[PDB]
Design an enzyme around this catalytic site. Structure first.
Site, PDB file in Angstrom:
ATOM      1  N   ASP A   1       5.169 -11.296  57.887  1.00 18.14           N
ATOM      2  CA  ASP A   1       4.131  -9.954  57.841  1.00 18.14           C
ATOM      3  C   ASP A   1       2.853 -10.088  58.600  1.00 18.14           C
ATOM      4  O   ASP A   1       1.979 -10.492  58.194  1.00 18.14           O
ATOM      5  CB  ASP A   1       3.941  -9.289  56.752  1.00 18.14           C
ATOM      6  CG  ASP A   1       3.354  -7.905  56.861  1.00 18.14           C
ATOM      7  OD1 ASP A   1       3.302  -7.543  58.147  1.00 18.14           O
ATOM      8  OD2 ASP A   1       2.894  -7.430  55.984  1.00 18.14           O
TER       9      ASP A   1
ATOM     10  N   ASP B   1       2.210  -5.150  63.432  1.00 22.04           N
ATOM     11  CA  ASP B   1       2.727  -5.024  62.045  1.00 22.04           C
ATOM     12  C   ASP B   1       4.139  -5.393  61.868  1.00 22.04           C
ATOM     13  O   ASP B   1       4.769  -4.505  61.873  1.00 22.04           O
ATOM     14  CB  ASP B   1       2.363  -3.931  60.992  1.00 22.04           C
ATOM     15  CG  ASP B   1       2.389  -3.922  59.415  1.00 22.04           C
ATOM     16  OD1 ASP B   1       1.373  -4.056  58.932  1.00 22.04           O
ATOM     17  OD2 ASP B   1       3.473  -3.935  59.083  1.00 22.04           O
TER      18      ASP B   1
HETATM   19  O1  LIG Z   1       3.804  -4.564  54.155  1.00 20.64           O
HETATM   20  C1  LIG Z   1       3.540  -3.582  54.840  1.00 20.64           C
HETATM   21  O2  LIG Z   1       4.296  -2.413  54.445  1.00 20.64           O
HETATM   22  C2  LIG Z   1       5.245  -2.458  53.226  1.00 20.64           C
HETATM   23  C3  LIG Z   1       6.014  -1.085  53.318  1.00 20.64           C
HETATM   24  C4  LIG Z   1       5.678  -0.153  52.362  1.00 20.64           C
HETATM   25  C5  LIG Z   1       6.578   1.155  52.452  1.00 20.64           C
HETATM   26  C6  LIG Z   1       7.396   1.395  53.438  1.00 20.64           C
HETATM   27  C7  LIG Z   1       7.533   0.126  54.329  1.00 20.64           C
HETATM   28  C8  LIG Z   1       7.160  -0.955  54.251  1.00 20.64           C
HETATM   29  C9  LIG Z   1       2.985  -3.351  56.146  1.00 20.64           C
HETATM   30  C10 LIG Z   1       1.577  -2.375  55.553  1.00 20.64           C
HETATM   31  C11 LIG Z   1       0.389  -3.122  55.355  1.00 20.64           C
HETATM   32  C12 LIG Z   1       0.554  -4.591  55.761  1.00 20.64           C
HETATM   33  N1  LIG Z   1       1.876  -4.557  56.121  1.00 20.64           N
HETATM   34  C13 LIG Z   1       0.320  -3.073  53.866  1.00 20.64           C
HETATM   35  O3  LIG Z   1       1.185  -3.156  52.982  1.00 20.64           O
HETATM   36  N2  LIG Z   1      -0.686  -2.318  53.435  1.00 20.64           N
HETATM   37  C14 LIG Z   1      -1.803  -2.018  54.792  1.00 20.64           C
HETATM   38  C15 LIG Z   1      -2.617  -1.429  54.915  1.00 20.64           C
HETATM   39  C16 LIG Z   1      -3.380  -1.123  56.117  1.00 20.64           C
HETATM   40  C17 LIG Z   1      -2.501  -1.883  57.426  1.00 20.64           C
HETATM   41  C18 LIG Z   1      -1.163  -2.328  57.179  1.00 20.64           C
HETATM   42  C19 LIG Z   1      -0.708  -2.552  55.756  1.00 20.64           C
END
Ligand SMILES: O=C(OCc1ccccc1)[C@H]1C[C@]2(CN1)C(=O)Nc1ccccc12
Ligand SMILES: [Zn+2]
Length: 394
Positions: free
Chosen positions: A224, A34
């Site tokens: 991402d 990720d």
């Molecule tokens: O974009 C993202 O984090 C933002 C962020 C928010 C807060 C703190 C730092 C970063 C990551 C996490 C991600 C996909 N990529 C998603 O958001 N939900 C999810 C659910 C399952 C797997 C991956 C994911």
């Protein structure tokens, strides 16, 4: 970097993961790759969607940091206990790192049934690590503790009772020239938090959307790998879909299709690809007033899904969707391209992937330079909340 070729796996639409070991003796876990987050976090207790999980108490090298962590996303949240342990990537560099690990003790809409991953490897920068930026991310530790150069690169390769298997390569510490063809073009990282970049223009089948370019980056644009779709700010999503609808209009699909919630199907091998337009995103160049375009095919933004009820048909899901937190160039974009995360030089490289899915009429492309005189600034400035302002950074 032959031993790192083809080190990723997953199910179409559910994330690409790499095998890692944590602890002594080594516990093997499949970890989501990720680039949109900065924590290393692993399931550490039983869950309906986990076959297995990290057992801290079985590792002689575990140290408990005596501090908890909580991250909520738009979709998904988890929490757990912070610690450190020994971590290696068997199909990665021949080193072992002591890294921070968040042991996930509870979660909601985070793990995905059938995805086969049990944790997340957040490869973005310390600024968005939780609880705060003093929790050093994995990649920073790997670089500090070993001789591995400060770059990695990603080749994500796109695809009846299970979803299609996918594969890819994460090359840690370099660039493997067999994974691309043609020129590698770089866009600067705007700020080191996300892998934030700047889109200066968007075209659908050659035609400019003609929006103020700040719209393309409202409120940010990021790369991402852990987001499966190309996600677009509401206004850009509505214009883009209007143009794709127009190109494809010999086929009248349900609302649900364009909402990303419903398959559409053709007789096997008869999919009319040529009625769907190519999408071109122009990214800021390293040089002022220069840009280059990455061009994807409907083979990237229509995801294949085999219907149990009609297994003789080729069926597809529309994998462009609306965002309220900016553009996300997810696996849809990345599946066209070999993507070089050049942290050392504060830039992201794109080249045409040697594994991208295409046809005999069209290919995914990376092309430049293109030039503008007196270019606007297309970056958006996020409103500074008092919370964020109050933080010290020592
Ligand atoms: O974009 C993202 O984090 C933002 C962020 C928010 C807060 C703190 C730092 C970063 C990551 C996490 C991600 C996909 N990529 C998603 O958001 N939900 C999810 C659910 C399952 C797997 C991956 C994911
Ligand atoms: Zn202070």
């Amino acid at each position: 970097f032959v031993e790192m070729v083809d080190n990723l796996r997953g199910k179409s639409g559910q994330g690409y993961y790499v095998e890692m070991t944590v602890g002594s003796p080594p516990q093997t876990l499949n970890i989501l790759v990720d680039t949109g987050s900065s924590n290393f976090a692993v399931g550490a207790a039983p869950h309906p969607f986990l076959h297995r999980y990290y057992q801290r108490q079985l590792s002689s090298t575990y140290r408990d940091l005596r501090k908890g962590v909580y991250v909520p996303y738009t979709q998904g949240k988890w929490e757990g206990e912070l610690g450190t342990d020994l971590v290696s990537i068997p199909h990665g560099p021949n080193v072992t790192v002591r890294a921070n690990i968040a042991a996930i003790t509870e979660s909601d809409k985070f793990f995905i049934n059938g995805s086969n991953w049990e944790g997340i490897l957040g490869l973005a920068y310390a600024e968005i690590a939780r609880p705060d930026d003093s929790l050093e991310p994995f990649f920073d530790s790997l670089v500090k503790q070993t001789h591995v150069p400060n770059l990695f690169s990603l080749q994500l390769c796109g695809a009846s009772e299970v979803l299609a298997s996918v594969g890819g390569s994460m090359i840690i510490g370099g660039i493997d020239h067999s994974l691309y063809t043609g020129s590698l073009w770089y866009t600067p990282i705007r700020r080191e938090w996300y892998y934030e970049v700047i889109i200066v223009r968007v075209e659908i089948n050659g035609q400019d959307l003609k929006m103020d370019c700040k719209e393309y980056n409202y409120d940010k644009s990021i790369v991402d790998s852990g987001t499966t779709n190309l996600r677009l700010p509401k206004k850009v999503f509505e214009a883009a879909v209007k143009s794709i609808k127009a190109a494809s209009s010999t086929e009248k699909f349900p609302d649900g299709f364009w909402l990303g919630e419903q398959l559409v199907c053709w007789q096997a091998g008869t999919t009319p690809w040529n009625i769907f337009p190519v999408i071109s995103l122009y990214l800021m160049g390293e040089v002022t007033n220069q840009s280059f375009r990455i061009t994807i095919l409907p083979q990237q933004y229509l995801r294949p899904v085999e219907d149990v009820a009609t297994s003789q048909d080729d069926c597809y899901k529309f994998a462009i969707s609306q965002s309220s937190t900016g553009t996300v160039m997810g696996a849809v974009i990345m599946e066209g391209f070999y993507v070089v995360f050049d942290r050392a030089r504060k830039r992201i490289g794109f080249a045409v992937s040697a594994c991208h899915v295409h046809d005999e009429f069209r290919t995914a492309a990376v092309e430049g330079p293109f030039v503008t005189l007196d270019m606007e600034d297309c970056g958006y400035n996020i409103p500074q909340t008092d919370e964020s302002r109050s933080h010290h950074h020592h």
